[PDB]
Structure 1
Amino acid sequence: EGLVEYIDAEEEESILIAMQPEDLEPAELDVDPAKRIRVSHHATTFTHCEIHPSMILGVAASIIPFPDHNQSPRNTYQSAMGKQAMGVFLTN
């Protein structure tokens, strides 16, 4: 139904992706101090939107809790180590 599209790296040269659908909301102050700081997009001619930014990660780092709060080599380290953790690898 043409609501979603496959883009490869060559093709993403010609596009402009939003990060969250909220980027498409119009604007025209009073903010939570504790939240992180997001620069306004200052771009309007969007053609696509990310499904979800967290989808940039692999299977391993998708286990890391709050990886947006740690220095990146630690995320690489945990990615290497979680493959060394024990658990039920198969129910059979």
Structure 2
Amino acid sequence: LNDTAKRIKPEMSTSSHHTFTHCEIHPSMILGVAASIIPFPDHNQSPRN
């Protein structure tokens, strides 16, 4: 790990054992048609998106 470049995936330390029931197919699918054109929308402040 310890990658100073890739973003830190959250620690999630409070919970001892996770029991997942579902997974996102891909997180970028939360956006709609118009927001899907934006490249790297996770590097912008939301009003600009």
* Class of the TM-score when normalised by the shorter of the 2 chains: 0.7 to 0.9
What is the distance in 2 between the residues matched to 1:67 and 1:41? Answer: 32
Q: Which runs of 4+ in 1 moved over 3 A?
A: none
Query: Which structure features the higher share of strand residues?
Result: 1
- Which structure has more relative contact order (CA 8 Å, sep 6+)? It is 1
TM-score normalised to the size of structure 1? 0.40
TM-score normalised to the size of structure 2? 0.72
Offset from partner CA, 1:29-63 (integer Å, 9 cap, x none) = xx21011111x996xx1011110000000010100
What fraction of aligned residue pairs are identical, expressed as a percent? 93
* Bigger Cα Rg: 1
Could you list the runs of 5+ residues in structure 1 that have no partner in the other structure? 1-30, 75-91
